[PDB]
């Protein structure tokens, strides 16, 4: 299983995650690849940032879900 991580700018990242994993884990991996602070990056999905430390089951996240990431730094 893997979920897509599309950035506000224009870049998607594939991250492998277990169905019974956790959103927090996803943030950690994304941070490892890009190297962006978790606080700065906003993991938006289903019209709202996913809560850290929450199993996919709750949000009922499917496979290859396109999660949006918006950087807090700069921008508006």
């Amino acid at each position: 299983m893997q979920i897509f991580v599309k950035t506000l700018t224009g870049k998607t990242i594939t991250l492998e995650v277990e169905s019974s994993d956790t959103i927090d884990n996803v943030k950690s991996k994304i941070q490892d690849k890009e190297g962006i602070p978790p606080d700065q990056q906003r993991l938006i999905f289903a019209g709202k940032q996913l809560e850290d430390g929450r199993t996919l089951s709750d949000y009922n996240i499917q496979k290859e879900s396109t999660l949006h990431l918006v950087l807090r730094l700069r921008g508006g």
């Binding site: 906003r42 938006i44 019209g47 709202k48 918006v70 921008g75």
Partner: protein, 49 residues
């Protein structure tokens, strides 16, 4: 305005429910800002009832 449409597109995919009309309205007013506009939109989807 010059390339806000791209940002608007992000909004469309960002919120699979908000009408394009609303996205365009807020986007235009908020000086085509995504961080602030979206930031507020995130909390909005707190709970229907």
């Amino acid at each position: 305005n010059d390339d806000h449409e791209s940002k608007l597109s992000i909004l469309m995919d960002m919120f699979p429910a908000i009408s394009k009309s609303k996205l365009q309205v807020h986007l235009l007013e908020n000086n085509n800002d995504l961080d602030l506009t979206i930031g507020l939109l995130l909390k909005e989807n707190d709970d229907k009832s």
